């Protein structure tokens, strides 16, 4: 059985929570805290292990962006550190190809990264790869056919509808068709061989619209919108459905969790997080050992 894990986040300060939602019995399981409260991080899973990448520690004692990589083992309910990235990356995006973690974009202070680096778990080593054509913070990242896509974001001046595609074999980025909508802080994921971009912020409004990229047609198409507009949401796929968690709607830090069914093209609100928050890292892996 697999659960939806949400790590970190922001509500008045960065958070250390690790909680796991069971879509069947509806429970939230409170697990070992992050070593450091972090928001604006990303989550992913390699070899059953949950990784928390980047982010920022906003605390009443001071604020710092994070280069950290940390690993959670559900079999032991323990976190352990990994080697850090070359630079701190707040509002990062990540994707997994061939068992390697790609860290994309994000910010360090006023620096908006176009740089990208790759983590090899079997060596605990990071290595820089070719930088993106665009500086992107609040970038959404997805992997399709072992190509890495970076979608949207904020370049420090403009928010973006552009998307680009990384070919690992060429070590080269190439622009693709832009989204219909400018989005920073959207949730981006892959489902049934399409890239979905949900929500985000366009510099005026937080968004509820959702669009889907078909690589065969190189076209973005709108699908059903979410019930609640939200930026800095967490997103993941569990058993063929998309789940979006939390975020910010210009007024409150949401605890709403919505679920997209592709067969019916409908969003449903399925649970609430134990407290509202934005900027979480989210991923799916085996339930913890009791
Ligand atoms: Cl994430």
Supply the DSSP string of 143-159, one letter for each residue: EETTEEEEE--B-SS-B
Report the length, in residues, of the chain.
290
> Domain range for residue 70?
2-286
Q: How far is the CA of 7 from the centre of ligand 1 (A)?
A: 8
From CA 244, how far away is CA 71, in angstroms rounded? Answer: 22
Q: Phi first, then psi: what are they for 182, rounded to 5°?
A: -70, 130
Helix/strand/coil for 126: strand
Q: For residue 143, which phi and psi values (nearest 5 degrees)?
A: -120, 130
- Which residue, chain included where needed, has tokens 């981006």? 188
Pairing of strands 49-53, 56-59: unpaired
**CATH number of the domain bearing residue 174:** 2.120.10.80
Determine the 3-state secondary structure of 32 from DSSP. Answer: coil
Q: Give 41 Cα–ligand 1 centroid separation in angstroms.
A: 7
Give the DSSP letter string of 215-252: TTTTEEEE-PPPSS--BS-EEEEETTEEEEE--B-SS-
Half-sphere exposure of 236 (CA within 13 A, CB side): 25
Cα(49)–Cα(72) distance, integer angstroms = 6
Q: Ligand 1 centroid to 42 CA: how many Å?
A: 4
Closest of 96, 265, 73, 235 to residue 152, by C-alpha: 235
The two three-digit tokens of residue 188, written as one number: 């981006």
Ligand 1 mean position to 200 CA, how many Å?
14
CB 254 within 8 A of CB 244: no
Name the DSSP class of 204: S
To 5 degrees, how large is the angle CA 279–CA 88–CA 46? 65
3-class secondary structure, 202: coil
Domain count, the chain: 1
The experimental method behind these coordinates is: X-ray
């Amino acid at each position: 059985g697999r659960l939806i894990y949400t790590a970190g986040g922001y509500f008045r300060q960065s958070l250390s929570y690790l909680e796991a939602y069971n879509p069947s019995d509806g429970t939230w399981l409170r697990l070992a805290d992050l070593q450091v409260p972090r928001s604006g991080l990303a989550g992913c899973v390699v070899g059953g292990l949950l990784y928390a990448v980047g982010g920022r520690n906003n605390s009443p004692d001071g604020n710092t962006d994070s280069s950290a990589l940390d690993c959670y083992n559900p079999m032991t309910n323990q976190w352990s550190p990994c080697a850090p990235m070359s630079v701190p990356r707040n509002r990062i995006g990540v994707g997994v190809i061939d068992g390697h973690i790609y860290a994309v974009g994000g910010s360090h202070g006023c620096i908006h990264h176009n740089s990208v680096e790759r983590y090899e778990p079997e060596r605990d080593e990071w290595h820089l790869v070719a930088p993106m054509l665009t500086r992107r913070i609040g970038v959404g990242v997805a992997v399709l056919n072992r190509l890495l896509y970076a979608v949207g974001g904020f370049d420090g001046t403009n928010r973006l509808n552009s998307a680009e595609c990384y070919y690992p074999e060429r070590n080269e980025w190439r622009m693709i068709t832009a989204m219909n909508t400018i989005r920073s802080g959207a949730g981006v994921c892959v489902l049934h061989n399409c890239i979905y971009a949900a929500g985000g912020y366009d510099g005026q409004d937080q968004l509820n619209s959702v669009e889907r990229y078909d690589v065969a047609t190189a076209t973005w198409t709108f699908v059903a919108p979410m019930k609640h507009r939200r930026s800095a949401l967490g997103i993941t796929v569990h058993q063929g459905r998309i789940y979006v968690l939390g975020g910010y709607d210009g007024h409150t830090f949401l605890d709403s969790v919505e679920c997209y069914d592709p067969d019916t093209d409908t969003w449903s609100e399925v649970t609430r997080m134990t407290s509202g928050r934005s900027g979480v890292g989210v991923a799916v892996t085996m339930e913890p050992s009791r």
